[PDB]
């Protein structure tokens, strides 16, 4: 990579000396070394880039967002200098975007990537990076347009193929997404061996009835993406006891389970009252997990945060639950009423994390037509009784009764998680 313009080649000796200090771990001394080069040579792009890299390393040594914010600006200063070589310009702004994403400045990272695409219009990899930027902010429409441009000039780019197929599947274009996901994974290009693409390829195949779906769950498991063929969560803590169905004693949460079963009728009655007098609080399921039917949820807690307006509708239930931080503090779970009507079939799916267990309390259960499968075992609900399963295992639900079915869903931390882990895991 050509990093020295005409002037920097003349001071290459001073530049290499400072870089050796940064490479020797003496970051604080290399910071002042490159700062002195920037003072003496204010137009040197290599001296400016060296100052940015040292600020980057110092931000890690101290885990400082404020220091990294300065490095982000210094990387941009490199681009504003005259006669900057193309390799140095690309490297500074790409790293700036990467650090903007690390800080959560996703809007800023997008502008940096847009500037790179304008500067190097032929580099398709920068377009692929711009596509990821749109995906990180949820703009699947602009991401789709980007990967369509990449596939027009580079039709066999595997990175662009899997990301196009992911967007297609997200838009419920199930049958269309499969060739892009399969051929993209099979390309072996960097960035295509990702669990997210094995997950959605196998799920797309399941929804169209293709038997090849479980062959891809096998390969995903063999490559280290899934704990097993059945358990396909992607945000995991390794080593947690993996088991489809649990008993209350196994979870250790006996006091919560007894409290739910002893007081189940009051939980039912507050849910029925919301159905009758405030049905707008029940929101339709919005993750494209239904094949058909009507399925809605009324959420009291999410990501360990109490929903204040929701607890005004179920005040006694919220008061009862606030005694159990193992569920109210579960930042990777929810507490919610869940209603399902006849004619509903929920696609096989898994949750995102192995760090929770999911409890179901039966509230209004018709005598026939309702069942839930987890892994290879199908069960039914009982009014006033708790079922416990690990929803990181593939599960599927049917509702073919003659009236509605109402349950209460209570997520808890996996019992084997230490208190330190429950406080540090990013919320989902």
């Amino acid at each position: 990579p050509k990093l020295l313009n005409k002037f920097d080649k003349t001071i290459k000796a001073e530049l290499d000396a400072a870089e050796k200090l940064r490479k020797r771990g003496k970051i604080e001394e290399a910071v002042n070394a490159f700062k002195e080069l920037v003072r003496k040579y204010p137009q040197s792009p290599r001296a400016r880039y060296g100052k940015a890299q040292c600020e980057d390393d110092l931000a890690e040594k101290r885990r400082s967002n404020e220091v990294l914010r300065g490095a982000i600006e210094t990387y941009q200063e490199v681009a504003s200098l005259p006669d900057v070589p193309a390799d140095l310009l690309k490297l500074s702004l790409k790293r700036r975007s990467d650090r903007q994403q690390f800080l959560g400045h996703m809007r800023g990272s997008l502008l940096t990537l847009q500037r790179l695409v304008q500067l190097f219009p032929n580099d398709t990899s920068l377009k692929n990076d711009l596509g990821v930027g749109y995906l990180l902010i949820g703009d699947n429409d602009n991401a789709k347009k980007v990967y369509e441009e990449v596939l027009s000039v580079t039709p066999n780019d595997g990175f662009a193929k899997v990301h196009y197929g992911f967007i297609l599947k997200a838009q419920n274009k199930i049958a269309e997404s499969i060739p892009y996901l399969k051929e993209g994974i099979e390309s072996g290009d960097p960035g295509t061996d990702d669990g997210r693409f094995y997950f959605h390829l196998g799920d797309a195949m399941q929804r169209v009835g293709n038997k090849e779906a479980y062959k891809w769950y096998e390969l995903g498991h063999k490559r280290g993406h899934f704990a097993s063929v059945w358990q396909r969560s992607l945000y995991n803590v390794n080593g947690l006891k993996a088991q489809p169905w649990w008993t209350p004693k196994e979870t250790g949460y006996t006091e919560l389970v007894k409290s739910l079963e002893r007081n189940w009728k009051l939980i039912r009655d507050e849910g029925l009252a919301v159905m009758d007098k405030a049905k707008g609080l029940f929101l339709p399921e919005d993750e494209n997990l239904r094949e058909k039917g009507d399925w809605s949820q009324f959420t009291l807690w999410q990501q360990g945060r109490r929903n204040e307006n929701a607890c005004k509708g179920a005040p006694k239930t919220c008061t009862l639950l606030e005694k159990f931080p193992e569920t109210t503090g579960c930042r990777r779970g929810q507490i919610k009423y869940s209603i399902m009507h006849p004619g509903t079939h929920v696609w096989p799916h898994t949750g995102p994390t192995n760090c929770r267990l999911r409890m179901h309390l039966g509230l209004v259960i018709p005598k026939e037509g309702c069942k839930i499968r987890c892994a290879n075992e199908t069960k039914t609900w009982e009014e006033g009784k708790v079922l416990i399963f690990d929803d990181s295992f593939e599960h599927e639900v049917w509702q073919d009764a003659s009236s509605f079915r109402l349950i209460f869903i209570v997520d808890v931390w996996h019992p084997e998680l230490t208190p330190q882990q429950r406080r540090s895991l990013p919320a989902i």
């Binding site: 931000a59 885990r63 400082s64 967002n65 990294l68 994403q101 690390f102 800080l103 959560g104 996703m106 990821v132 995906l135 990180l136 949820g138 992911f166 997200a170 997210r196 997950f199 959605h200 969560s233 992607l234 945000y235 399921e285 993750e287 494209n288 997990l289 999410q302 990501q303 929810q334 799916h349 898994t350 949750g351 995102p352 929803d391 990013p426 919320a427 989902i428």
Partner: peptide, 18 residues
């Protein structure tokens, strides 16, 4: 969007620096 019951989003967590 949030990953409440499945893995529908490209990423399910948020970045907040260090």
């Amino acid at each position: 969007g949030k990953c409440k019951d499945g893995l529908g989003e490209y990423t399910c967590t948020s970045l907040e620096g260090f």
